[PDB]
Each structure stands twice: as structure tokens, then as C-alpha cells.
Design a protein around this nucleic acid. Sequence first.
DNA 1: CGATCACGGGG
DNA 2: GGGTACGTGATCG
Length: 757
Amino acid sequence: HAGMIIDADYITEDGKPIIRIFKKEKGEFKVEYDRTFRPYIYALLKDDSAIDEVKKITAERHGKIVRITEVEKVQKKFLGRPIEVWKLYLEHPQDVPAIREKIREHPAVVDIFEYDIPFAKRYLIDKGLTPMEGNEELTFLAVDIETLYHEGEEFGKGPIIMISYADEEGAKVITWKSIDLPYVEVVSSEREMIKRLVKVIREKDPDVIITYNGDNFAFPYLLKRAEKLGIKLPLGRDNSEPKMQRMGDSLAVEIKGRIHFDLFPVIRRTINLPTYTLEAVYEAIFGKSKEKVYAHEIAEAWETGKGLERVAKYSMEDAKVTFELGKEFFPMEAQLARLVGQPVWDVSRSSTGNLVEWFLLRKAYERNELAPNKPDEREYERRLRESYEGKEPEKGLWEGIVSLDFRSLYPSIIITHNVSPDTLNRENCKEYDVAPQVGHRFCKDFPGFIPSLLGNLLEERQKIKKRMKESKDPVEKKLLDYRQRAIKILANSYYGYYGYAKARWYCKECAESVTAWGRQYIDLVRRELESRGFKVLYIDTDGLYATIPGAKHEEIKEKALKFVEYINSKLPGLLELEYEGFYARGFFVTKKKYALIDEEGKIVTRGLEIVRRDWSEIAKETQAKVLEAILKHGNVDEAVKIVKEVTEKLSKYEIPPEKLVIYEQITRPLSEYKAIGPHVAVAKRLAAKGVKVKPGMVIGYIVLRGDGPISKRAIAIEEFDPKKHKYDAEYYIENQVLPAVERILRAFGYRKEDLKY
DNA sequence: CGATCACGGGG
DNA sequence: GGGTACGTGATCG
Ligand SMILES: [Mg+2]
Ligand SMILES: [Mg+2]
């Protein structure tokens, strides 16, 4: 029709699938239904006569037998070669996992294809439907909750004590205790507060619900408490409840007819932070501080009734900034959805590797190219163990560091050298390009599937950039700016995608060859930098860090900016080097393990910081102190003295026991564990005392002095008696503090043995 | 040793 | 739900 597609799914009616297309048409919510789309897979047979045995294969599901409804002989392309496969139709999507292995096992079946694409995604591709097209303006609502938590409680034990929401009308708090603030609505109970949230959402009818970690906290918690209280959450536009989907080891929540936009996975990919707390995230984007009110402060205020205004202000600000961040990060996710042709819900929760794959599956359909299969476990494992043919960084502390980015070099290399799995070492090829050093041959006789698509993306970006220069409308310009950035992101992900172990179009030789050709330009950049007095401190496939030893910082910045402008004038086509940034100081340990500090004093690290609950505070605190001594004080000698003093204090039992607590979650019933770690040993004793130990409960423990593995010497933090129990100083030194700092201090020539008296 | 198991965000 | 992360490091067995 005319509207913007925001999502798609399927429902089953009288055992048959119905596709639903969720649309927004000039401000109105619309649902279109399609009963005609049929599930299918492909089968390559040894011979056409075999179809008579294959079409008769059956399976079982929902107490009924599953059959192939129709078969169709089709002509397609596989690896740039014509192929004849049989399209096997099935009645219901759930018939595909039930029958696919019974077809694959058949002696007449060479292989099966396209048997794991979800029905709603299969529909959008086959029908040529693209989400988020048009100038349709969506409505947004941020949602958040505060709860009553005590250390180690089962998930959902304590009530929800506040629910906050925010949009352009302001930020509001719903609570069931008397708090006298203008934005606070006081209700009678937890039940009445949850029913008020339901009413707000049904009345405001937002297209987008913005949360911060709503997938794994706010919505699973609301669902747990609504279950306990025996109330429904009809938040879906079809009155359905929020739906929890197991996405990996964690969860993802969907709200039918809407976009549940969880900012946590989105921001985690976009920017680099040691910890992605809402307060750290808000400050990195808006340059303003946000106060954190910790779980224990919240519990204390609720139970004593004192200082509840502070907790209500915290709840309000949580919703307020969640709204602000949502508006900031949504436009780019909307353009990426449009580009890849899949809904924002899915696109915002996926890696760039999956964004590339979704883009390629759609283009394969458009081009009548059969998609290769995802690897089996053994192949995936064989791919992770593959070695690539074709430096370690400078030691010590460096000053005035410029960062240069190479990533925009690789799409142009893929295109000019026709680097694709369908062009690699092709038989009876008339002309080919040979990769330097690795010698892989890529046929020049026809454009490769992936170079062809990249060429079109880069051309489309150049058109957008030209239309941007010629536009007087700042609205169109803002939108076109997002569109051209989406292409840059997608195009710059192909190099990585070639080496991604889960990729359908995985190609080790393609990745290797792009690296080998890329290196010729990197070596040119390095020689040209050194001829200009620059010293290269660190270099990898993504970029480099350099300085002019002992030069004035403004001179380094000017010379680097002049260098980038010069080299890009020398580089042919769309090969581009970028000036990324400047740092006051920094040091480099190894590949993607380094730490820097900018001119505003913000520490920036990669592959070193250990901010996680399963590491003791003493190890995390010492590591922070070491990085601060090095980057803020330019003093490695102070850092070594900090480690030496901490280790002596641990040996003389001068460290508070509270800085020694280790936290680990129970993730299954205790009887299901194959290996009993210290937290499981502690948990089993707690359950033996009558504690209801459940998956989700976090176990706090201290390692005590003694013989054997740490499993037999861990004690529950609640059972620790400082007057009776002695902590293991050698464990906290050798397994906690020293591993936290040894990688960092290796960059300065220190070994683990030199960090003690 | 290989196998197993945990982390993040949120209260 | 025709795709159940992601990559990495500690500890058990
Ligand atoms: Mg969906
Ligand atoms: Mg909150």
C-alpha cells in the first residue's frame, strides 16, 4: 500500500500461517494480512527421477504427520554457476525444522539449502518489501522501573517500587509510597502501579518503546511481578503481552505492533566505553554528569521511608535521559534497517556481520542466487582454527598521539580486484588477479557477487553525498547524512564478514587477499609518515597510532591533518585515510590492547579494563590506580609502587574483607553442573541449609587460606567472620591483583615477578 | 591439557 | 518461533 513498514511477523490460524505487516500510514497504525505466502527449502538431487522418492518424505509435528505440499524444478545460480534444484513447499514454517534433516539424509539428495531463514524475514525478501521507507514520523516513549533489591536475592523477589516514563510532554514517576514531587503519581499498590503503566502505554500508543537494558531487566521483571500479582500486561497493539525471546545466553523482548528499542546493545556497538552504565553513556554523548543512586541506597530509602525524593528524582532522570538517548540513536538504526531490509527490532540487536548477511540474502533472491548454508559446528570450529598468512607495538609511555583509520581502504580493494568466493581459483578463467604473497587467483571474466554489490553501495553513497552538496533543505540533508553513513558502516563491514566464522559467504582466501593488497597501502602510509618525522607506535589492519617524538602537540595535529589531505590526493578512487583523533598520552601492549588519555583527561582503553562482578574490588581498584598513575601522572614508577604496596597489605591481612568478595551467578539447577566452581560449592551449602537456590541468583564469596583447589576453600560472604576466617592472600595476589596489572606493566618491560617486595 | 563456565547492562 | 550472541579468560576434572 502507501505506509512505512515498521515490522512483520506471522500468526497461526486453523493451523495455517498468516503473515502480518505492521505499518504506519500518515500517523495511522495499519495491519495488512497475507495468507498466501508458503514456506519452502531447496534440494539438489543426484538426478531428476529421484524427486518421486523425495516428494514422498514425511515427518511429525503437533500430533499430525508433515508432508511436502508441492515440488517445483527451478533454475538458479550457485557460486556463479547455473544449477537445477527442487523447491519443496511445506504448509507451516514449523514443518521446516521437523522435516529438513529427513530430506538431507536421503541417498538421492546432494544437499539442501535456505532451510533456516525465519518466515517473516523470508516474506520481506521474497516480496521485495523494505522496512522504514518514507518520511513517516514515529512516536516515542521511554520506560524504566526501580525495584527493591537485597544482595543475592532470586530475580523478581522484591517488588517494583517505581515505574517511570518520559516523552516530549515530560518525565513522570508512578510509585505506591507517598513522595511529594510535581512529577510523581502516588497509587495504592504495586499492582495499581503496573496497571497505571499499562494505561499510559495504551493511551499514548507509542510506535517505539525505548528502554535501557529492558530486554534483560525492566520487561522480564515486569513480567515476573505481573505473574505473581496475577495481572496481564496487554502492551501489544493486538493486546498481546511483551514476548521474551531467548537470544543467545541472554533475552530480547518484543512488543507486537511496536518497536521495543533497547539502547543497551545499540550503544555498546556504536561507542567505546570501559563500562556501559546509563550514567557513563549519557555523559559520553551529551557531555553532562548524571548521578547514580545504588540499589542499597534505594532499598534503604524505601524500607526506612527516608530520602525517597532522591530515589524518585533518580527514577525520573533515568526515563528522561533514556528518551533523550533514544531520539539520538534511533535515526541511524532506522536507516540501517532500511538499507539491510529487515525491521529495527532485529537490526538494533545484531552485529555488523549479520547486517551484511541479511543484505546479501536479499540480494541473492533479487539475483536468483542460491544462498550457501551456515556452517555446522565442526566447520565453524575448523574456521576458528584457520591460520592467516601476512607488528608488535612500541614499548613505553608516549605523548601527543594521532590516531589514523584505514577501514575505508578495503571496499575499494574488494571491488578493483574482484575479490569474491565465486571468483576464487575459477576453472577455464581467461583473466585473473593474483593476490600478493598469498597468491590466490580471482577471475576477472565476470563481476563477483560481493564486488558487484559493494560497487553499487559506493556509487549510491557518492550520489547521496552529491545530492547533499546541492540541497538547500536542512531536513533532507540531515536524512541524507544518516543514509550515506549507513552505507559507509555496511560497506566497511565486508572485509570483516569474509573472515566471520558463522558467515554463509565466508571466504578465508578472500579475507587474506584483501589483507595482502591492503598492506601495500599501509606500508606506503607508514613510509610517508616516517619520511615526515613521525614514529609509528602501533599498527593493525584497522589503523595506526603515531607521534613526532618531542614535538609540540599543535604541530603534530597540523602535520597529521596535512598528511591525510596529501595521501588522499595520491590514493586513487574511493581509497580513503581518516584522521580519527588526538591523545595527550598513551601506551600499547599488543593487538587491540592499549590505553590512551585525551586532552580533556578521559581515559580510553581497549582489551585491558576488568570492570565485572566476578573480579574482586581490590584487583579492579588497583588496576584503575595503575592506569591513573600511568596516564594521569605519566608515572609508571608510581604504578609499580602501588602494586607492590597492595600485595604487601594483602600478605599482612591489612585489606578490608569487603574488597575481596567475588560474585558469580547460578545459571541452572545445581544438579545440572558438570564442573563445581567455588560459587557452586558455596551454593550447594546454601541449598543444604534450606536456601531456595535458583538460576539468576548471584553468589558472593571469599577465598580462604588452605590446601587444594579454591572450590573447597570458598566461603559465603554472609558466613565470613573476620575474627575466625583468614582470607587467601596468595590467591588474591597471584590470581586477582597481579593478572589485573601484569598485561599493562609488560608494555614498560615489567614481568609479574618484579611487582612485589 | 580439554571442558566447562562466567562476564556485560539493570535494582 | 525455518537464525538462541560474542569473545575471552579463569578454574575444574
Ligand atoms: Mg520479530
Ligand atoms: Mg531506573
